[PDB]
Design a protein around this ligand. Structure first.
Ligand SMILES: [Zn+2]
Ligand SMILES: [Zn+2]
Length: 44
């Protein structure tokens, strides 16, 4: 929207994404990124 929230994973793209933050991991996460498991969520 305005440089407010961006996927923690630097590898992620710049294009718009799904603003999904992890309860345990404050870092921003995407809906698709989950399937990739690039972040390695503790509850995933
Ligand atoms: Zn992402
Ligand atoms: Zn997480």
């Amino acid at each position: 929207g305005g440089s407010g929230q961006h996927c923690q994973v630097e590898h992620c793209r710049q294009r718009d994404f799904l603003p999904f933050v992890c309860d345990d991991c404050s870092g921003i996460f995407c809906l698709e990124h989950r399937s990739r498991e690039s972040h390695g969520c503790p509850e995933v």
